[PDB]
Amino acid sequence: AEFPELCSYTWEAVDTKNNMLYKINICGNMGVAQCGPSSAVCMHDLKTDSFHSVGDSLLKTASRSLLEFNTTVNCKKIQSSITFLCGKTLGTPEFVTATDCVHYFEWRTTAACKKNIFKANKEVPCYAFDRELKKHDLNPLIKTSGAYLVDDSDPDTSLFINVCRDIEVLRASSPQVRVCPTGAAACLVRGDRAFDVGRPQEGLKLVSNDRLVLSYVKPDFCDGHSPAVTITFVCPSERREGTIPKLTAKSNCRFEIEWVTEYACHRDYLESRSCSLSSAQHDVAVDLQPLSRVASDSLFYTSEADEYTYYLSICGGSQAPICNKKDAAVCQVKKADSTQVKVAGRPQNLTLRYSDGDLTLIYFGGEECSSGFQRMSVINFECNQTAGNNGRGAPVFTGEVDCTYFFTWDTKYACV
Amino acid sequence: AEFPELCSYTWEAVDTKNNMLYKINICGNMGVAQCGPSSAVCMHDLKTDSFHSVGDSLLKTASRSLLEFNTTVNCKIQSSITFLCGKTLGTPEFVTATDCVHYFEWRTTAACKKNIFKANKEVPCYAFDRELKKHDLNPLIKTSGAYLVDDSDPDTSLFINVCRDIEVLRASSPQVRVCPTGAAACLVRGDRAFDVGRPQEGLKLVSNDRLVLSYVKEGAGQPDFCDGHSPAVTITFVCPSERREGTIPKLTAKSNCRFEIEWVTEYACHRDYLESRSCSLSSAQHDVAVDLQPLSSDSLFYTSEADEYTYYLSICGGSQAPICNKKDAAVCQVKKADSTQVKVAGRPQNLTLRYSDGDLTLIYFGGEECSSGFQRMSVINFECNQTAGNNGRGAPVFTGEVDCTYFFTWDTKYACV
Ligand SMILES: *[C@@H]1O[C@H](CO)[C@@H](O[C@@H]2O[C@H](CO)[C@@H](O)[C@H](O)[C@H]2NC(C)=O)[C@H](O)[C@H]1NC(C)=O
Ligand SMILES: O=P(O)(O)OC[C@H]1O[C@H](O)[C@@H](O)[C@@H](O)[C@@H]1O
Ligand SMILES: O=P(O)(O)OC[C@H]1O[C@H](O)[C@@H](O)[C@@H](O)[C@@H]1O
Ligand SMILES: [Os+3]
Ligand SMILES: [Os+3]
Structure with missing residues (x-):
């Protein structure tokens, strides 16, 4: 009954900018009694070290992609909103923002997919x-x-x-x-x-x-x-x-x-939400920006597949005319029918990551596949001092797994 | 090579409009004189009882879905055969002839990308x-x-x-x-x-x-x-x-x-x-009278719900659903799990109304290709029923797909002999 796989745990989310910690119970029978026996979303104002409920279990509103929690608490009515998106793991609820009266969250999770195959x-x-x-x-x-x-x-x-x-x-x-x-x-x-x-x-x-x-x-x-x-x-x-x-x-x-x-x-x-990582924050200095310009005639890279062609323009790079209407970091074009253009990642939704020796650039927020999964692209960058195009190199499509598109990219700009 | 399963025979096509009968042999080895051993397309002129080759098997230019044959002759003469994936060997249909250039269309299994139809x-x-x-x-x-x-x-x-x-x-x-x-x-x-x-x-x-x-x-x-x-x-x-x-x-x-x-x-x-290329059959030509035009105050299109898709049918001049008002189709398919996917399962200009052995069938073709190469096609099996809802007009019932050929049952009073 409504994301059963998330109901037996207390989930935490935080608003870093304001030092607010949230305790979430999708089935709020709980214990977060700290906000009361009916609170589904408990807020810990670490500033005054106090708790205030911003979503009551009984005043819930559910649909496939949206869970809303209300309160009887007047506002300068306070409520909580959780946008659900299909994900390939249980994931975690992410704090989006908190307006005057509403507290927003986003949760990519296998419990929100159209098909149970991801669960x-x-x-x-x-x-x-x-x-x-x-x-x-x-x-x-x-x-x-x-x-x-x-x-x-x-x-x-x-x-x-x-x-x-x-x-x-x-x-x-x-x-x-x-x-x-x-x-x-x-x-x-x-x-x-x-x-x-x-x-x-x-x-x-x-x-x-x-x-x-x-x-x-x-x-x-x-x-x-x-x-x-x-x-x-x-x-x-x-x-x-x-x-x-x-x-x-x-x-x-x-x-x-x-x-x-x-x-x-x-x-x-x-991680960074931009195309660079710094020594101070990540202990590694990276800047892939110099790749947004391929400068010549096409500020976009192209990667051929068996049945499709991928066009990539990363780090604010300009896109190709065939996708001059979708706003896509990564655009998939069907060969048999060049009219079918699927978005495999958006520029506003980038995550540059460095962990255990690997540099990964992830673009998400693409058009949904029947599973409900927003297509996403992950680029496994590799260091190569002598990469072609003056070290810029070029992305190679290596394959797809259920709407996640994988590319390999050898480049000098990925050398720590 | 070049469509191997077509070469084992000589295929006839006709231009009744001008009383012309063509003998086609993709590999040119037909033998039938009056045009030569190398003639791939021999044109027997019945009004004068003479034969003239309009395509030599040697002067062949081949493309994915196109075969062209040039001859030695030349007015101010050549042949072109367009190939489209089909579910049977089919027949080379004469489409028209220009200033000494004869066109043909051939929907055949020999032209399917996926050799699963052979x-x-x-x-x-x-x-x-x-x-x-x-x-x-x-x-x-x-x-x-x-x-x-x-x-x-x-x-x-x-x-x-x-x-x-x-x-x-x-x-x-x-x-x-x-x-x-x-x-x-x-x-x-x-x-x-x-x-x-x-x-x-x-x-x-x-x-x-x-x-x-x-x-x-x-x-x-x-x-x-x-x-x-x-x-x-x-x-x-x-x-x-x-x-x-x-x-x-x-x-x-x-x-x-x-x-x-x-x-x-x-x-x-x-x-x-x-058959007819319109929504009506006559007693004089078909020995049976039928008019489905009346099926063409509310929405001017029909809808048939399916498990994964929704089918909108615009029959006999009717109008499509605003969702498909971006292409042109008689049958339009839209994926429910993602309304962005709109596929043409049949076009208005490609319709065949057929009556044979008691069955009345309306067929729309020219739909969008599937990976196999097969253009989508819809076949509407009409049935007689005076007490059909919608004031007899009835409504299409989607009954299943089979390799990009969509079937429908349609009970209507207009389907009665
Ligand atoms: C949540 O509070 C609102 C305010 O009275 C109620 O009305 C709307 O409810 C829908 C879904 O139930 C929300 O999507 C809207 O945002 C609400 N309006 C707004 C903006 O306040 C709603 O009835 C309350 N939930 C309950 C108790 O059912
Ligand atoms: O949502 P569906 O029907 O499962 O289709 C998913 C498929 O859609 C398109 O054909 C392409 O984007 C494929 O790469 C993708 O795998
Ligand atoms: O061309 P493909 O990749 O074989 O897909 C064919 C399928 O495409 C879409 O999903 C629909 O039109 C189906 O009815 C069809 O059978
Ligand atoms: Os042991
Ligand atoms: Os016997």
């Missing part, structure tokens, strides 16, 4: 705010197909895990993973046999300023011991190349795993 | 008569399944397809899936399936109004109960002197693995007797 058998909140109200988000690590191989000295066994959810085994990239039990968050393969050594229960936990842990709980070798998996994610003090998660203890079906990943650091250290 | 073996399925009137059996060709022939025999089941093999691999009926691949005629005598006839020669016009199709099965492996005889199937299609309900093919002889089948069908009659 995981079991997924839990995958983020947490630290003492400073900075978000540590692991959603980027969540696999929708397959899982991660854990490093261990046991050559006759493979340990597979996913993050914050079960491992999708039916379409797994690895043949081994495909032999795993359905619904398992951690799977152990031995002698062509796979065991379910841990399933998703509670959301991600933040223990140390720079440490997050995820616990999975549920076989011969267990000798009377319920299998358990505990992953500890650590934000390193210095930027380094990505590392595989490592096994630190396999004491009788009681697995301990440490994963050094910059995704465990606060998010603003990894 | 049969294991298909042959020409039409023939022109002395009056240059066409007798086309293409509509009876099944891209899936077969026709169960009426034999009255209790021990056997005899299945056939028209001008082509029965698609066994992906057929619904379990009994047909037991038939050998490539068989055009399948005999089930003993819970066993036998191939007693494969296609080879095209449709032949015997009686100036009688069509004959001959399937042969020569060589070793003849069934033991056939006694040194090679199986063979011979179907005679006969045009009824008067309109009547379509009948089933009838087995009229079954000597030694030799089958003689008679099929009384109005599809055997000249085409202009079964």
Whole structure:
């Protein structure tokens, strides 16, 4: 009944500019009693250290893409508004803005898709705010197909895990993973046999300023011991190349795993809403702006596919005439019928990210696919000092997965 | 190469408007003199009884969906054949001739991007008569399944397809899936399936109004109960002197693995007797009067709801839904999960109203291409019903799609003979 997969948790959102923290319960039976037993959206004014409800559970209004919460509290009537968009993970509600009387939020989540195919058998909140109200988000690590191989000295066994959810085994990239039990968050393969050594229960936990842990709980070798998996994610003090998660203890079906990943650091250290990252904020100086101008005759790049042609103009770059009406960072054109023009990403919706050695430029807000998923494009930039076009290089379409378009782009401007 | 399955035959086309009969052979190896061994398009002038080539097979320029042939002659003479993906081998339709340049359009399976529409073996399925009137059996060709022939025999089941093999691999009926691949005629005598006839020669016009199709099965492996005889199937299609309900093919002889089948069908009659390019049929030309114009205070378009799409029909001059008021179509498809997707499933200028074997059918074609290359097409199966809602006008009921060909049922008082 209305996003069932989000109802058993208390979700947090913050308004950084005003130091306001929001506690959200889509089924507000809860406990945020801090605002009362009926409050669905509880606001903590950290300034005066006080709580005020800005959305009551009973005064709810629901539709496929919009949840509204009202109050009887007069305003200089206060209410909350949550715009839902289909996403490929449970996601997190993002604070958009707060007008005089209304508090707006946006939530990209698998629980808002037109098709159930995007919904995981079991997924839990995958983020947490630290003492400073900075978000540590692991959603980027969540696999929708397959899982991660854990490093261990046991050559006759493979340990597979996913993050914050079960491992999708039916379409797994690895043949081994495909032999795993359905619904398992951690799977152990031995002698062509796979065991379910841990399933998703509670959301991600933040223990140390720079440490997050995820616990999975549920076989011969267990000798009377319920299998358990505990992953500890650590934000390193210095930027380094990505590392595989490592096994630190396999004491009788009681697995301990440490994963050094910059995704465990606060998010603003990894991302920018513009085409540049700075040493001061991200410990890396990047500026892809010099790419918006290809200058010559076409300030847009083109990337050929089997059935389509992609036209890209990034960082405010000018677009091509065939898309001179859609306002698109990335524009997909059907070859058989050059009249079908789909937007695969918009310029106002850019996220430049650097984490674990990878520089990624993500454009979202594209036209929706039947699943309800706004088409989006992610560009995996690669450093190349000698890239053609004086180092600017050129994007290569590498493929599509359910309306997310992938490109690779070798360029000197992606060299840290 | 160049459409390999078209070269095995010589295809006729006609310009009745000028009494011209063309012999087409994409590979030029036709032999028929009066125009040469290299002539790809030979034009027999019936008014003078002379032949002149309008296209030489050697002077060929090929494009994706276009074949052109130049000759040595040259007025102040050449040929062009436009190819469009079709679901049967079809026929090269003469469209017009200019200042010594003859045009043709050919909707055929041999021009489909996705070779999923090609049969294991298909042959020409039409023939022109002395009056240059066409007798086309293409509509009876099944891209899936077969026709169960009426034999009255209790021990056997005899299945056939028209001008082509029965698609066994992906057929619904379990009994047909037991038939050998490539068989055009399948005999089930003993819970066993036998191939007693494969296609080879095209449709032949015997009686100036009688069509004959001959399937042969020569060589070793003849069934033991056939006694040194090679199986063979011979179907005679006969045009009824008067309109009547379509009948089933009838087995009229079954000597030694030799089958003689008679099929009384109005599809055997000249085409202009079964079809019109407008929404009306006359008693004089069609032997039946029909006018669907009246179906053309509220919305001037019809709507048929489907699971994933909505279909808007603008019939006989009617007007489309404002949502499709950006192209031009008689049938327009719009995806519900994304109203931005508007596809033309048929165009007003491409309509065929047909009456044959008791069924009244309105067809719109020229729709937008699918990845296969097939232009979308809508076929509206009309039914008689005096007590039809909307004051008899009734309304279209979408009944399903099949590879970019959309079907509809339409009960209306205007569909009554
Ligand atoms: C929410 O408060 C508003 C104000 O009285 C009520 O009216 C509108 O309700 C719709 C949906 O219910 C909202 O989309 C509008 O924004 C509301 N109007 C505005 C702008 O105030 C609404 O009835 C209240 N919700 C309840 C208690 O049902
Ligand atoms: O929304 P649908 O019907 O699932 O179609 C989705 C498809 O739409 C268009 O054809 C293109 O954008 C494809 O890349 C995309 O995958
Ligand atoms: O050309 P494609 O990629 O095979 O798609 C064909 C399909 O396109 C759209 O989704 C609709 O028109 C369907 O009815 C049609 O079958
Ligand atoms: Os073990
Ligand atoms: Os017999």
